[PDB]
Each structure stands twice: as C-alpha cells, then as structure tokens.
Structure 1
C-alpha cells in the first residue's frame, strides 16, 4: 500500500521536473544568492533597461499586463502536459480532462508562482529578472492591484517550506477535484484524488518531521486558492472597462 504511494510520488516528481522550466529548488537558490544574478526591476528606468537586457512600445502598465498574460498562457500549456502524466488522467473522458484543466489551471499557476516569490518581489523570464513587489503596486489603477493578493498568499504559503516533491503531489490533488462544475464522471476522478491525497499525506509525514499540521494546512490552502482566482477574475472584469487573450477569455467565462 505504502510502496505504491511512494512510487506514485516519484512518478509525479519526475514528470514535474520535465513539465516545468523553473523548479522551486532552482528558484530559491537564485533568490538566496546561492548560485548569475537576475536583473532587478524596481522602477520605471530599470523596467526599460530590463526589457532591453533580458531575453523575453505601449503604456508601461499595459506592457507588463500583456507579458504576464502571455506567460499565463504558456503556464497552462505546461500544466496541461503535467496533468496528462498523472496516472489515470488520460483515461478520463476528454470533456472532463478539459473541464478539470479549465477550472484548475489558475489555482496551479498561483501555487507555483509562490516558488518564484519572496517578500520583496518575483522572479521573471525563467529567473533572468526580478520584479519588485512595490514596483508592481505602483502601477496605475487597477493594474497595481493584480499581484498583491498573490504576494500575500505566497509569503504565507512559502512559510510552509514545501519542496518540489511535495508540490508535485499537491498540484495533482488540485487538478483532480471531483466537485468542478459540468463534470460527466465524478467517481473515477474522486478515486484518483483519494489515492493522490494518501500519497500526499505519506509524503508530508516522511519529508516534514518538523510539523504534523502540514496536511491539514495544505487542505486549507486549496480553498484559499479558489478565493484568489475569484478575486483575479473580478479584477479582470473591471479591465473590460479600460488586448485580452482569447484562450484566457474562454477559461474566464466558465469562472464567472
């Protein structure tokens, strides 16, 4: 029983390493200076210098919004390739595969975003850049309101000190939520998640002797993430009153 759960964990970790360009391990090493330093964007001048220097003519707030929008669409492709590696996922009905992805990707994006963040800012362009929390806040309304709730989540989430092995299972649990609207076959999804949760619980016990509360804390974080997405899509709704990506538009119309 436990041997199969450890096999699941390893399979997910190996797939995780394949699917995502920058792991938390590599991100924290860059953030602590335990490695070539990223270009720091902290004001308008450094933003322009960063755009020329970093290998990635409109209004600054819009330019940053567009780049982040396009990074989000790349993120969903990465998550989709990871999802297909989760044992049993591809055996699900295709309509349920896409439904789980649509309702789940943004929760996963903000989960993994936390790996790139500290209290001072966020790693961008696969660790080549570092954009400060206060610079993002200084952007004109309502663009300055986007990242702050993510930073707020990240500092609390990062205090849990999860590693890539923990996160691989955590994100798999989130993708396979049987309570997403419009699901055709709930039972096979619940079966997979129950096994992933067992694997998660075992992983946390072995990997984190310093805390017996982690599993419960992580369940709490899963509900918190749903609130972050809801806040994000509502802030996206008021921007309809100020070039939105069509793929994201399709995801949002289900989320509204």
Structure 2
C-alpha cells in the first residue's frame, strides 16, 4: 500500500539517521537524565572548570567558545550531508541544487539536533563528553553572552513536543528538501520528494503521537521558527565579524555564510 511504503520510507530515514549521527536524542536524554552507564559528562560551569575541561574533553574564552561551536558546526555539516545523501532521490538531483539545499538548510538542521542535546540548564558537547551550563554561556562578555540564548529558548519549547529520533529523521528530511531555497535550478523534483516526505511525516506523527493534537501543524511552524533562528544567528555573526578581527572562519562555514 501507499501507506505501507510511507512507513518503509520512515524506517529507511531512521536507519540512515542512526548511521549518520553518532549522538542520537535517545542516548542524549539518557545522559541528561542521568541514566547512562557510560562516563558522565564533565561539567563546565565557570572559567576554572572550562580550564579543567580543556584537558578532559591564546584567544580569550569568549572567542574560544564561539569558535568551538563553529568547529562543531563544521562536523555537523558533514554528518548532515551524509544523511541528505540517503534521502531517496537526493543524489539524483542536479548537483548544484544539492549544494544549494545544504547551503541554505544545514543550520536549520543543526539547531534542530542541538535541541536534542539541550535542557533548560545546559547543553552536551563533544558527543556527551562535556556539559556546558546555559548560565555560563550567557555570562560571556558581549556579544558572545547572547549567542545561544535564542537556541536554548527554541529547544525548551521544541523538546516539550517530545519527538523521538524516528520523528526527527523525517522532520529533518522535509526541511532539507525545501523547494523555496534561493537559486534552485529544478524545483519540481525537489517538491515532489518533499511532498512524499511530508506525507510520511504526517503518518508518522499520527501513529507515534495519536493523542498529540495538531502535532503536524506545530512542526510545520517549527520549520518557520528555525529559519528565524538562523536569520538572527547570521545577523549576530555580521555583528561579530564587524568588531571581532583576527577571527578566522573555517572555509566550510565561509562557503555556507557567503551570499547568505
């Protein structure tokens, strides 16, 4: 049946998601709720513990932290790219369109997955090796002390929806296959794939969250919310590059931030 195939697609995406992302939400919440049997994360809550953690896990702390997020972003972009290549039809799209979809979609995916590693008090870093408190992150000097608050605010609300990794795999796939990204050469094939992905997400939510009224509509809205988060992040970057010199940006990020 058409529905049966939508479930096979959902499962395919989930399996692909597990192969592409080393730290899943399931494992992450286990660490955050204190249920894991693995090594507990080293907590970074102040300048002194940041120093200690810098050995467990020249530039000022504020820049070191900001650049640390950038480096994790570089790693995330590569994981997301590997995941994208597993979405049925993606590798057969015009190659420049694949680039475009990733260029304009990766941060939205990064912030979606980041939420999986966050709670109201902090965020897991380096695949669960550390936990950096939210308070410490906003205690950074200007403009770095506001860097992540918008992401924590988004995550608390997003996590309240209680999605699991199976829901997320499809949610992420839908966002990557956005036919409205600037400069796409062939929108139709992208839209046809996304339409099928949206049907799969709808069915996934109806089956996995039967009592969660209007969850699908809520997720469509979160997709819009994520674009606003990226917009603000991009603006804060410009503000940073406009006052923070000597700061080198990873070439992969320079490519993504260019004309964006």
Partner of 1:143: helix, strand, or coil? coil
1:47-85: CA deviation from partner (whole Å, max 9, x where unpaired): 10111112xx32111111121111101100000000000
How high is the TM-score relative to the length of structure 2? 0.95
1:203-242: CA deviation from partner (whole Å, max 9, x where unpaired): 001101221211000000000000000100100001112x
RMSD: 0.7
| Structure 1 gap segments, 5+ residues each | none
Measure the CA separation in 2 of the matches of 1:150 and 1:253: 22
1:245 positional shift: 1.8
1:254 positional shift: 2.6
1:116 positional shift: 0.2
1:246 positional shift: 2.2
Partner of 2:30: 29
Partner of 2:162: helix, strand, or coil? coil
Measure the CA separation in 1 of the matches of 2:249 and 2:237: 9
1:145 positional shift: 1.2
1:43 positional shift: 0.6
How high is the TM-score relative to the length of structure 1? 0.97
Partner of 2:55: 52
Measure the CA separation in 2 of the matches of 1:21 and 1:126: 7
Q: Which runs of 4+ in 1 moved over 2 A?
A: none
1:37 positional shift: 1.6
1:24-64: CA deviation from partner (whole Å, max 9, x where unpaired): 00000000001x3211101111110111112xx32111111
Instruction: Please tell me whether residue 216 in structure 1 is matched to residue 221 in structure 2.
Output: no
Matched pairs, number: 251
Partner of 1:230: 231
Measure the CA separation in 2 of the matches of 1:63 and 1:180: 32
Partner of 1:209: helix, strand, or coil? coil
Measure the CA separation in 1 of the matches of 2:222 and 2:210: 20
